Amino acid sequence: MAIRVADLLQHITQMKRGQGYGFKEEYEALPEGQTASWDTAKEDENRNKNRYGNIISYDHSRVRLLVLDPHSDYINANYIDGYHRPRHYIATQGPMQETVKDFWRMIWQENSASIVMVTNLVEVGRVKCVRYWPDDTEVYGDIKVTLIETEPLAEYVIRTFTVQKKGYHEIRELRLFHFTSWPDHGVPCYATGLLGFVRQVKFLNPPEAGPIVVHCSAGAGRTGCFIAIDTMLDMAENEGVVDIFNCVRELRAQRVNLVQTEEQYVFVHDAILEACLC
């Protein structure tokens, strides 16, 4: 069911014409809600580690933390396969006050070099994510994080840090790619800025490092869009085809409801098309 890149404009058009099979039906065919077990996530002892009760971590794909407390192994995060590479990303919720330390522990544990943040901290008066990075230097658990560079651009900001587990000698470099123009449950007016942002991550992420951590507020909608676009550009570049429906289907098998609205699903298509034209 793959679509030739050469045929993508025609496909998207046909899919936007209300007259035959289109995006509403296609989106409605994606599996909605829970499709696999999440027994650990729904443990009483882990309720306060989950931001949204409906978007919690499937057992098969969940990122397990070293146990410190038998329930210390839980974070609301899942490995997500990329095009080339299994466990290429971790999709997770935006940290909560309670989970900031767990978040940095996962980063250390997993050898992650990149964080992709596709939310603002507050949106229309609602907290979406707690600030989990320092203005200067801060210790989260025993993870010491120091800001070394800020690069502001029009629709996003890249912040670079050193990261060190206290009492050990390794000092790592990490980048936080923070996209600032994408509203929760919404989509950007244009794909262009987001595509530049994607291009930066692909350019700068060290491929020898651990998974790229991707998060929004719940870790489904905008997180899923970023992952879908990123993956499909790899597929397009390599095969001259994209299969966005099975991509998002596969995304949902690994973590519930990634790409959370029809408008987002359509936006993923528009963004991939633009990248392919360019």
Author numbering: 889 to 956, 959 to 1168
Q: Which lines from the publication concern this structure?
A:
Protein tyrosine phosphatases (PTPs) play a critical role in regulating cellular functions by selectively dephosphorylating their substrates. The ∼280 residue PTP catalytic domain consists of an α/β structure, and biochemical and structural studies have led to a detailed understanding of the catalytic mechanism (Barford et al., 1994; Zhang, 2002). Key features of the domain include the PTP signature motif, the mobile Trp-Pro-Asp “WPD” loop that in the closed conformation positions the conserved and catalytically important aspartate residue, and the phosphotyrosine recognition loop.
In the fourth category, both the gateway and secondary pocket are blocked and the inaccessible binding cavity harbors an aromatic residue or a proline in position of Arg24. The second-site loop assumes a twisted conformation in these phosphatases. This architecture is present in the subgroups NT5 (PTPH1, MEG1), NT6 (PTPD1, PTPD2), R1 (CD45), R2B (RPTPμ, RPTPκ, RPTPρ), and R4 (RPTPα, RPTPɛ). In contrast R1 group members (e.g., CD45) and R2B group had a more than two orders of magnitude lower enzymatic activity, suggesting that enhancement of activity by tight association with substrates in signaling complexes may be important for efficient signaling.
